[PDB]
């Protein structure tokens, strides 16, 4: 009863998933991926692309900051380093925190991570 | 005379040709200027991208 309706939106730097289908305020949108396909890359790809644009509504990105809080688990040795690569590329790691429990870090720690 | 007919027949083709060929030498001069123009516009766009990105990188580092 302390929860209100969506009334704002975010922009992930893409076309089809922000024009044709607006990713709104506090939306829970799952991305069903396959197997034999790299989930992980197509993820972080959209990391740097995503910088919000509520410009057109009359609000800044100072009243909508770009904070990436990431919690994976059971990720490969390449992929876990390929993640940090994207971030360290261009400035976006002094406004975000990573957490990512390696596939060689115990199954007990998996759960609490989030 | 038949010959007074014929001289009007060359002077007729040889003006159409030379207007067609100054309507290609105009068209090319336009499309090339608008080309040259757009290839420096695109040059403008690139420079911004590469400077906006760069300043952010060097800020985050510091």
Swiss-Prot record, chain A:
Transmembrane segment boundaries: none
Annotated S-S bridges: none
Biological function: Produces ATP from ADP in the presence of a proton gradient across the membrane. The V-type beta chain is a regulatory subunit.
Family, as annotated: Belongs to the ATPase alpha/beta chains family.
Name of the protein in its database record: V-type ATP synthase beta chain
Species for this entry: Thermus thermophilus (strain ATCC BAA-163 / DSM 7039 / HB27)
Encoding gene (name): atpB
Curated annotation (Swiss-Prot), chain B:
Source organism, top-level taxon: Bacteria
Family per record: Belongs to the V-ATPase E subunit family.
Protein role: Produces ATP from ADP in the presence of a proton gradient across the membrane.
Protein name, as recorded: V-type ATP synthase subunit E
Organism of origin: Thermus thermophilus (strain ATCC 27634 / DSM 579 / HB8)
Organism placement in taxonomy: Bacteria, Thermotogati, Deinococcota, Deinococci, Thermales
């Amino acid at each position: 009863v302390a929860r209100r309706k969506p009334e704002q939106f975010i922009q992930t730097g893409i076309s089809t998933i922000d024009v044709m289908n607006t990713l709104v305020r506090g939306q829970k949108l799952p991305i069903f991926s396959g197997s034999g396909l790299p989930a992980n890359e197509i993820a972080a790809q959209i990391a740097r692309q995503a910088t919000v644009r509520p410009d057109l509504s009359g609000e800044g990105e100072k009243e909508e900051p770009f904070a990436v809080v990431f919690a994976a688990m059971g990720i490969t040795q390449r992929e876990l380093s390929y993640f940090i690569q994207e971030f360290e590329r261009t400035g976006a790691l002094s406004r975000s925190v990573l957490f990512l429990n390696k596939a060689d870090d115990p199954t007990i720690e998996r759960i609490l991570t989030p | 005379k038949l010959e007074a007919i014929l001289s009007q027949e060359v002077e007729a083709e040889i003006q159409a040709l030379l207007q067609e060929a100054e309507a290609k030498a105009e068209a090319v001069k336009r499309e090339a200027e608008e080309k040259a123009k757009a290839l420096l516009q695109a040059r403008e766009r690139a420079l911004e991208a590469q400077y906006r990105a760069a300043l952010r990188r060097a800020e985050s580092a510091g």
